[PDB]
């Protein structure tokens, strides 16, 4: 292969990257969209405060751009997210019970409906646990509505879009902790239960040298209990500058990371948050680490490539 797509599509998965619509404009930007990839997701265009800044005020604009995107370069589009604690709205943080219940429902109904046909798959709930284990302590929606919250999503984002895969997303669960023991409860549960889930989304927001060693395992006991699983938004960061060694173990880690899933055959594919390191979110979020992507600031590939391509 001479593409991570064609690489990706070779091995019948999916390789996709987080867009940032405006970026479309940028030449060397859009060529490695364009040729690199087979699936594509919002980095910010679908969440919440993008979609819908006032009560009952959508704007698709920027998540239209993306989906069209998707659909005129033959790419799948995976949506990016529907409830989540973060980036939420003040408007939404003001209301509560009934209220907030009806707008988070609303919300779901709204936007799932208007992308319905066009986004194939949804990370319908995303961050719900907490590093440790048990729910996240910092959520509006587990403190507003309690535990109940995510089942109330997921089967209203099934009556809006009936066929869509809706997936459950999260950090740090990628190995078996306690942290992703909880969530593999909550799956077990809902599929036991008949509640809408066909999905789990591994974040993968890795640091370099730090690969779960169990990862396959973790993948595959999630995968048997009925669903497919999904490496959503993958970078592995690692301490700034880079040099030689650091992006040599970088390396490594992509390909262990593409070949846990390789090694899952529910496992629909690897999608890396963003394209170039130019524009990663990881070094205003984490000071001091950065360089975490395939593609350097000068859109030259950089060890991680040739891993991929090879895992695939
Ligand atoms: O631009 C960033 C964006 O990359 C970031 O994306 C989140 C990363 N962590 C997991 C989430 O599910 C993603 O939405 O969100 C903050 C934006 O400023």
Same mark, same amino acid.
């Given at each position: 292969? @001479? @593409? ?10 999916? $390789? ?34 993008? /979609? *819908? ?18 659909? &005129?370069?033959?790419? *799948? ?12 709205? &003040? ?17 779901? /109904? ?7 046909? =066009? ?9 719900? $646990? ?21 089942? @109330? ?9 009936? +066929?869509? =895969? ?22 077990? &549960? $809902? ?6 889930? &066909? ?32 490496? /959503? ?12 060694? =650091?992006?040599? +173990? ?14 899952? +055959?529910?496992?629909?594919?690897? @999608? ?28 030259? =590939? ?11």
């Amino acid at each position: 292969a @001479t @593409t991570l797509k064609e690489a990706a599509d070779g091995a019948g998965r999916d $390789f996709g990257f987080a867009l940032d619509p405006n970026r479309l404009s940028e030449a060397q930007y859009k060529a490695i969209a364009d040729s690199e990839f087979n699936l594509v997701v919002a980095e910010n265009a679908m969440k919440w405060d993008a /979609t *819908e800044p006032s009560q009952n005020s959508f704007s698709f604009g920027a998540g239209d751009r993306v989906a069209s995107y998707a659909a &005129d370069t033959g790419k *799948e589009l995976y949506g990016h997210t529907l409830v989540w604690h973060s980036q939420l709205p &003040d408007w939404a943080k003001n209301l509560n019970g009934s209220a907030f219940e009806s707008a988070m429902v609303n919300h779901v /109904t709204k936007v799932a409906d208007h992308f319905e046909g =066009k986004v194939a798959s949804w990370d319908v709930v995303n961050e719900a $646990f907490a590093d440790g284990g048990g729910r996240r302590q910092d959520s509006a929606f587990q403190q507003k509505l309690g535990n109940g919250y995510i089942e @109330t999503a997921f089967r209203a984002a099934r009556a809006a879009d009936p +066929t869509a =895969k809706l997936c459950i997303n999260d950090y740090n669960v990628e190995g078996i902790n306690a942290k992703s023991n909880s969530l593999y409860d909550l799956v077990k &549960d $809902f599929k036991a239960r008949g509640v809408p889930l &066909d999905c789990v989304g591994f974040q993968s927001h890795l640091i370099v040298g730090q690969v779960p060693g169990d990862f396959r395992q973790n993948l595959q006991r999630f995968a048997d209990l009925g669903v497919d699983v999904r490496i /959503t938004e993958l970078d592995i960061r690692m301490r700034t500058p880079s040099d030689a060694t =650091k992006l040599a +173990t970088q390396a490594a880690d992509y390909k262990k990371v593409v070949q846990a899933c390789m090694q899952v +055959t529910r496992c629909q594919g690897v @999608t890396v948050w963003g394209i170039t390191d130019k524009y990663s979110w990881v070094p205003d979020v984490f000071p001091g680490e950065g360089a975490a992507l395939v593609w350097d600031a000068s859109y030259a =590939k950089k060890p991680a490539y040739a891993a991929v391509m090879e895992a695939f």
